[PDB]
Design an enzyme around this catalytic site. Structure first.
Site, PDB file in Angstrom:
ATOM      1  N   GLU A 198      48.449  29.917  41.367  1.00 28.12           N
ATOM      2  CA  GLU A 198      49.050  31.001  40.731  1.00 28.12           C
ATOM      3  C   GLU A 198      50.428  30.836  41.182  1.00 28.12           C
ATOM      4  O   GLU A 198      50.633  30.826  42.451  1.00 28.12           O
ATOM      5  CB  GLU A 198      48.310  32.434  41.203  1.00 28.12           C
ATOM      6  CG  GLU A 198      47.005  32.622  40.968  1.00 28.12           C
ATOM      7  CD  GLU A 198      46.999  34.149  41.259  1.00 28.12           C
ATOM      8  OE1 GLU A 198      47.640  34.932  41.120  1.00 28.12           O
ATOM      9  OE2 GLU A 198      45.312  34.490  41.230  1.00 28.12           O
TER      10      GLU A 198
ATOM     11  N   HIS B 115      39.287  36.843  46.455  1.00 28.41           N
ATOM     12  CA  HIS B 115      38.290  36.182  45.566  1.00 28.41           C
ATOM     13  C   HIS B 115      36.828  35.859  46.456  1.00 28.41           C
ATOM     14  O   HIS B 115      36.561  34.738  46.541  1.00 28.41           O
ATOM     15  CB  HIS B 115      38.665  34.758  44.776  1.00 28.41           C
ATOM     16  CG  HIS B 115      39.953  35.164  44.136  1.00 28.41           C
ATOM     17  ND1 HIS B 115      40.465  33.806  43.783  1.00 28.41           N
ATOM     18  CD2 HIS B 115      40.507  36.083  43.527  1.00 28.41           C
ATOM     19  CE1 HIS B 115      41.679  34.006  43.060  1.00 28.41           C
ATOM     20  NE2 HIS B 115      41.745  35.401  43.035  1.00 28.41           N
TER      21      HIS B 115
ATOM     22  N   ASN C  29      40.591  31.378  39.313  1.00 31.34           N
ATOM     23  CA  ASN C  29      40.239  32.900  39.304  1.00 31.34           C
ATOM     24  C   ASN C  29      39.102  33.278  38.918  1.00 31.34           C
ATOM     25  O   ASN C  29      38.696  32.918  37.695  1.00 31.34           O
ATOM     26  CB  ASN C  29      41.504  33.736  38.750  1.00 31.34           C
ATOM     27  CG  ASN C  29      43.018  33.176  38.983  1.00 31.34           C
ATOM     28  OD1 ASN C  29      43.213  32.230  38.578  1.00 31.34           O
ATOM     29  ND2 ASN C  29      43.582  34.053  39.826  1.00 31.34           N
TER      30      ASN C  29
HETATM   31  C1  LIG Z   1      44.351  41.793  44.735  1.00 30.20           C
HETATM   32  C2  LIG Z   1      43.404  40.971  43.909  1.00 30.20           C
HETATM   33  C3  LIG Z   1      43.594  40.414  42.967  1.00 30.20           C
HETATM   34  C4  LIG Z   1      42.863  39.498  42.061  1.00 30.20           C
HETATM   35  N1  LIG Z   1      43.211  38.947  40.988  1.00 30.20           N
HETATM   36  C5  LIG Z   1      42.338  38.302  40.203  1.00 30.20           C
HETATM   37  C6  LIG Z   1      42.642  37.445  38.832  1.00 30.20           C
HETATM   38  O1  LIG Z   1      43.966  37.751  38.465  1.00 30.20           O
HETATM   39  N2  LIG Z   1      41.826  37.119  38.233  1.00 30.20           N
HETATM   40  C7  LIG Z   1      40.284  36.749  38.624  1.00 30.20           C
HETATM   41  O2  LIG Z   1      39.768  36.286  37.822  1.00 30.20           O
HETATM   42  N3  LIG Z   1      40.209  37.413  39.747  1.00 30.20           N
HETATM   43  C8  LIG Z   1      41.056  38.082  40.662  1.00 30.20           C
HETATM   44  N4  LIG Z   1      40.622  38.854  41.570  1.00 30.20           N
HETATM   45  C9  LIG Z   1      38.896  38.574  42.041  1.00 30.20           C
HETATM   46  C10 LIG Z   1      38.258  39.871  41.079  1.00 30.20           C
HETATM   47  O3  LIG Z   1      38.576  40.843  41.016  1.00 30.20           O
HETATM   48  C11 LIG Z   1      36.753  39.577  41.659  1.00 30.20           C
HETATM   49  O4  LIG Z   1      36.223  38.587  41.623  1.00 30.20           O
HETATM   50  C12 LIG Z   1      35.756  40.507  40.877  1.00 30.20           C
HETATM   51  O5  LIG Z   1      36.236  41.925  40.710  1.00 30.20           O
HETATM   52  C13 LIG Z   1      34.377  40.486  41.404  1.00 30.20           C
HETATM   53  O6  LIG Z   1      33.475  41.260  40.470  1.00 30.20           O
HETATM   54  P1  LIG Z   1      32.199  41.550  41.213  1.00 30.20           P
HETATM   55  O7  LIG Z   1      31.410  42.113  39.912  1.00 30.20           O
HETATM   56  O8  LIG Z   1      31.539  40.671  41.967  1.00 30.20           O
HETATM   57  O9  LIG Z   1      32.865  42.911  42.251  1.00 30.20           O
HETATM   58  P2  LIG Z   1      33.560  44.045  42.053  1.00 30.20           P
HETATM   59  O10 LIG Z   1      34.716  43.863  40.882  1.00 30.20           O
HETATM   60  O11 LIG Z   1      34.098  43.906  43.523  1.00 30.20           O
HETATM   61  O12 LIG Z   1      32.866  45.446  42.155  1.00 30.20           O
HETATM   62  C14 LIG Z   1      31.884  45.860  42.943  1.00 30.20           C
HETATM   63  C15 LIG Z   1      31.877  47.287  42.789  1.00 30.20           C
HETATM   64  O13 LIG Z   1      30.743  47.949  43.439  1.00 30.20           O
HETATM   65  C16 LIG Z   1      31.098  49.075  44.201  1.00 30.20           C
HETATM   66  N5  LIG Z   1      30.441  49.110  45.312  1.00 30.20           N
HETATM   67  C17 LIG Z   1      30.296  48.191  46.393  1.00 30.20           C
HETATM   68  N6  LIG Z   1      29.275  48.614  47.410  1.00 30.20           N
HETATM   69  C18 LIG Z   1      28.766  49.819  47.039  1.00 30.20           C
HETATM   70  C19 LIG Z   1      27.573  50.330  47.271  1.00 30.20           C
HETATM   71  N7  LIG Z   1      26.770  50.046  48.314  1.00 30.20           N
HETATM   72  N8  LIG Z   1      27.204  51.679  46.381  1.00 30.20           N
HETATM   73  C20 LIG Z   1      27.923  51.826  45.248  1.00 30.20           C
HETATM   74  N9  LIG Z   1      28.906  50.955  44.974  1.00 30.20           N
HETATM   75  C21 LIG Z   1      29.522  49.890  45.448  1.00 30.20           C
HETATM   76  C22 LIG Z   1      32.669  48.709  44.708  1.00 30.20           C
HETATM   77  O14 LIG Z   1      33.263  50.139  44.876  1.00 30.20           O
HETATM   78  C23 LIG Z   1      33.101  48.104  43.388  1.00 30.20           C
HETATM   79  O15 LIG Z   1      33.615  49.157  42.420  1.00 30.20           O
HETATM   80  C24 LIG Z   1      41.565  39.617  42.440  1.00 30.20           C
HETATM   81  C25 LIG Z   1      41.002  40.659  43.158  1.00 30.20           C
HETATM   82  C26 LIG Z   1      42.003  41.362  44.138  1.00 30.20           C
HETATM   83  C27 LIG Z   1      41.730  42.135  45.179  1.00 30.20           C
END
Ligand SMILES: Cc1cc2nc3c(=O)[nH]c(=O)nc-3n(C[C@H](O)[C@H](O)[C@H](O)COP(=O)(O)OP(=O)(O)OC[C@H]3O[C@@H](n4cnc5c(N)ncnc54)[C@H](O)[C@@H]3O)c2cc1C
Length: 498
Positions: A353, A439, A477
């Site tokens: 990136e 990530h 990503n």
């Molecule tokens: C600063 C930053 C920049 C990024 N940039 C990019 C990008 O440009 N492109 C990209 O592809 N990826 C990017 N990512 C990565 C991407 O956001 C994540 O890979 C993705 O959000 C993961 O999805 P997920 O469904 O696994 O979990 P998450 O999106 O992390 O969602 C998990 C959810 O579960 C909730 N949760 C957790 N534990 C519990 C519990 N015990 N009880 C109730 N709720 C709970 C959390 O609060 C959260 O809302 C970025 C991440 C960050 C932090």
């Protein structure tokens, strides 16, 4: 009480799952530990920006922190704060800090929006048990469409001051024989062009991204979750953190759930039961729940692969000092548009990136988030003393990622006669940040802790849907892959199980 299906979390895996359950007519409750981000704050905006951080920036911290790479310029605006249910969490393990979103929409609230498919050749390497044709022919296209992925106007990109930073790195990479690619995004690039014209309220062009975007970014609350709510079959309860999962005597699941206020005070503890349980709590959150359940005996049939196979997607951050004649601009869009593609599936692979610098003044710095191919993996283990899953990962394990990043950026420096910055990450001579990730991937790997559709081994009607499924790396990503896998998995699960 009882609800037919429960989904833990509201990130990418969870949102896909809830939409498809609702469309199938299944009454579904999502439990999200963070807030629904829809109430204006003290400035009239939902989210704080990076030059005005406040308690909305941070999940239960007592001081705000500058975005990685920007400390030298942004520390001056960071402040002590009251611990609050803010949007970005830094989870600190012994030798790794993992950033995650907290709220309805999970990481979609805070991420940079880059919506990228992995190389098919690499997908086939990391997940050989999965039919790659169905992924590239069906599920990736579905994910891109539902996520509202869009592409930048390339003429506007070439002309606008807001992407000078990207054009500079493109030119510098080119001198080293390295190419760049445009990266699709869920931020509306048409809206961004109107921001630059002074026609609509700014967000990307007003140093917002990592604590949320007040405009322009199509986070999951606007896409999958809005559609899920629209089915009339889906409810979301916020500030509800799931603590424990157990199997009930008739083969359902029961959860203990804490309801809190935004100051972190406990309001109630509830037990919620269901027939079908979907984990979408993220790489960290889903894995922690299952490791705890296994090792405390509430899901004793879970296998030994639960907790294994974690990696940071090879994330490494570094920065170069440009020549004086290559300023990167005071005005930098907060949404990346270009990446350096040097990913050939070898151990020297890098997809980098070209990241903006949110200083609001000229720094001559180019910032990069490198995504590398590092086979090292960590493991979550249960600590019964603190009742937490702890990530076993050492900084030494990122040596291969640092080496791949360094080889690429040494090539660019040599071609251009430039040097690294060594001073962006604190009071130490350090050109490569090697102990963070954005990530997190793995912990409940598809086909190892689960079947090939995320059915948790040892159990029926128990599913993992999220980044914990991915085996530590995707070379780009990750959210498009998480979304596409979730679409594949939930389609099969609903057809065959529900
Ligand atoms: C600063 C930053 C920049 C990024 N940039 C990019 C990008 O440009 N492109 C990209 O592809 N990826 C990017 N990512 C990565 C991407 O956001 C994540 O890979 C993705 O959000 C993961 O999805 P997920 O469904 O696994 O979990 P998450 O999106 O992390 O969602 C998990 C959810 O579960 C909730 N949760 C957790 N534990 C519990 C519990 N015990 N009880 C109730 N709720 C709970 C959390 O609060 C959260 O809302 C970025 C991440 C960050 C932090």
């Amino acid at each position: 009480g009882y609800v037919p299906a429960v989904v833990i979390g509201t990130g990418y895996g969870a949102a896909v799952s809830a939409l498809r359950l609702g469309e199938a007519g299944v009454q579904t409750l999502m439990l999200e530990m963070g807030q629904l981000w829809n109430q204006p704050g003290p400035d009239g905006n939902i989210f704080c920006g990076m030059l005005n951080p406040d308690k909305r920036s941070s999940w239960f911290k007592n001081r705000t922190e500058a975005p990685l790479g920007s400390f030298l310029w942004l520390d001056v605006v960071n402040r002590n704060i009251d611990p609050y249910a803010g949007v970005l969490d830094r989870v600190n393990y012994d030798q790794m800090s993992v950033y995650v979103g907290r709220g309805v929409g999970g990481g979609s609230l805070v991420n940079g929006g880059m919506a990228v498919e992995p190389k098919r050749s690499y997908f086939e390497e990391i997940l050989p048990r999965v039919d790659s044709s169905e992924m590239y022919d069906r599920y990736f296209p579905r994910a891109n469409s539902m996520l509202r992925v869009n592409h930048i106007d390339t003429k506007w990109f070439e002309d606008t001051e807001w992407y000078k930073f990207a054009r500079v790195s493109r030119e510098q990479a080119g001198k080293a024989g390295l190419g760049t690619v445009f990266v699709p995004n869920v931020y509306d690039f048409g809206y961004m062009q109107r921001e630059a014209a002074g026609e609509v309220p700014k967000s990307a062009l007003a140093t917002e991204v990592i604590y949320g975007n007040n405009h322009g970014k199509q986070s999951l609350d606007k896409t999958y979750l809005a559609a899920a709510l629209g089915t009339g079959k889906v409810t979301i309860q916020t500030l509800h953190q799931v603590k424990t999962i157990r199997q009930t005597k008739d083969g359902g699941y029961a959860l203990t759930v804490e309801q809190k206020d935004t100051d972190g005070k406990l309001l109630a503890t509830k037990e919620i039961s269901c027939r079908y349980l979907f984990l979408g709590a993220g790489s960290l959150g889903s894995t922690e729940l299952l490791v705890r359940a296994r090792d405390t005996g509430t899901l004793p049939n879970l296998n030994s692969e639960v907790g294994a196979g974690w990696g940071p997607n090879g994330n490494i951050m570094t920065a170069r000092a440009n020549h004086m004649w290559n300023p990167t601009g005071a005005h930098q869009s907060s949404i990346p548009a270009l990446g350096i593609d040097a990913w050939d599936n070898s151990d020297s692979s890098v997809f980098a990136e070209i990241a903006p610098m949110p200083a609001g003044l000229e720094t001559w710095v180019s910032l990069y988030l490198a995504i590398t191919k590092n086979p090292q993996r960590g493991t979550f283990v249960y600590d019964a003393a603190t009742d937490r899953a702890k990530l076993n990962w050492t900084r030494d394990q990122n040596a291969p990622a640092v080496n791949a990043a360094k080889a690429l950026f040494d090539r660019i420096n040599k071609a251009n006669g430039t040097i690294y910055r060594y001073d962006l990450f604190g009071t130490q001579l350090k050109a490569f940040a090697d102990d963070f990730c954005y990530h997190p991937l793995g912990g409940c790997v598809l086909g190892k802790a689960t079947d090939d559709y995320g059915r948790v081994a040892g159990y029926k009607n128990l599913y993992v849907t999220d980044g914990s499924l991915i085996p530590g790396s995707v070379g780009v990503n990750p959210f498009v892959t998480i979304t596409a896998l979730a679409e594949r998995n939930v389609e099969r699960i609903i057809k065959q199980d529900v």
